[PDB]
């Protein structure tokens, strides 16, 4: 078996081999990648996203999110406050600011003690969940507005023809904004890519390990677990590495860079934070390795988690039996 202690692989691909995407995924899995539930790919040297970011200030952020944290350092939960809107050039001011601004450090390594210790006192903006792209319409290699979509992936792997879109997600970061522990929705894979700015620090449990870190959820957040019999789904829970060690959950970490893509793999639960002001451009695809993922993904039917149009073809074909309480949840 390849990668049998699920480390987190990273990939150099040449440019001839980035002109077949769902080839070169195939292989990173041939080489064991999908064991660690993340991987880092750095595009070839002559590759580019845009020519240039110089004229990106006046996208809309229309309901920047203020994450408030509650528990303790190691163990909280983030709540969304929505804020008026911003344009990014306003919205990078305001991660510049004093309030808002990276502190002084030595090196990523102290960054990520500042992060723990201290995050829980501040409440950073996020402009999350954008849909839009910035990658140039003439990029053709790696082009997240430009990949084959879910719903085609099902259709040709089962023959079945659903309505649904599949299209890009836009991520505006400051200093301390977190992603809460999560897999993606459908247990889905995702791919990131980091158009511009200051770092993203990820921690990743291996797929086959993640029921581990749910039932630590489960204790630590006990009233959660008894109010949804998958509340991860609702993408507000933080444990830091320290607790997890503690409770010899198996992860790794890394830390992503401005043009650098990431890899999640179905089933790899992941969290993580912005080191500044940063964008990233994100979107779910699948292979056909996904689909026996999809069949078997948890579910929220208690309503918090609130998901797209396109997942509920997803649920109705993939899941059958869940459909009817899941659509309840979403309605
Ligand atoms: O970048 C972020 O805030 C969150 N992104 C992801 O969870 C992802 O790409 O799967
Ligand atoms: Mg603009
Ligand atoms: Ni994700
Ligand atoms: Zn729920």
Same mark, same amino acid.
């Given at each position: 078996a390849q990668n049998p202690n699920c480390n987190i692989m990273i990939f150099h691909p040449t440019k001839e081999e980035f002109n077949d995407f769902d080839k070169y995924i195939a292989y990173m899995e041939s080489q064991g990648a999908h064991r660690a539930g993340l991987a880092k790919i750095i595009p070839p040297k002559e590759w580019k996203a845009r020519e240039t970011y110089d004229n990106i200030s006046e996208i809309l952020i229309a309901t920047p999110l203020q994450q408030v944290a509650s528990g303790r350092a190691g163990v909280f939960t983030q709540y969304h406050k929505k804020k008026k809107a911003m344009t990014v050039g306003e919205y990078r001011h305001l991660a510049n600011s004093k309030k808002y601004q990276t502190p002084p450090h030595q090196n990523f390594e102290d960054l990520e003690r500042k992060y723990w210790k201290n995050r829980i006192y501040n409440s950073p903006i996020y402009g999350a969940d954008?849909?839009?792209?910035?990658?140039?319409?003439?990029? #053709?290699?790696?082009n997240l507005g430009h990949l084959g979509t879910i719903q085609d992936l099902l259709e040709k792997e089962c023959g079945v023809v659903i309505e649904g879109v599949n299209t890009p997600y836009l991520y505006f970061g400051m200093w301390k904004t977190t992603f809460a522990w999560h897999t993606e929705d459908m247990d889905l894979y995702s791919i990131n890519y980091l158009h511009l700015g200051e770092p993203k620090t990820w921690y990743v449990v291996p797929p086959e390990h993640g029921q581990r870190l749910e039932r630590l959820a489960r204790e630590l957040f006990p009233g959660s677990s008894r109010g949804c019999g998958?509340?991860?789904?609702? #993408?507000v829970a933080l444990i830091s590495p320290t607790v997890l060690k503690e409770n010899g959950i198996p992860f790794n970490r890394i830390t992503q860079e401005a043009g650098e893509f990431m890899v999640t793999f179905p089933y790899g639960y992941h969290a993580g934070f912005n080191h500044g002001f940063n964008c990233a451009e994100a979107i779910n695809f699948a292979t056909p390795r996904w689909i026996d993922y999809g069949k078997m993904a948890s579910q929220c039917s208690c309503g918090e988690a609130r998901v797209t149009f396109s997942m509920d073809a997803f649920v109705r074909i993939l899941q059958p039996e869940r459909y009817d309480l899941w659509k309840r949840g979403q309605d």
């Open positions: 954008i849909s839009g792209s910035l990658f140039d319409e003439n990029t #053709k290699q790696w998958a509340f991860l789904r609702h #993408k």
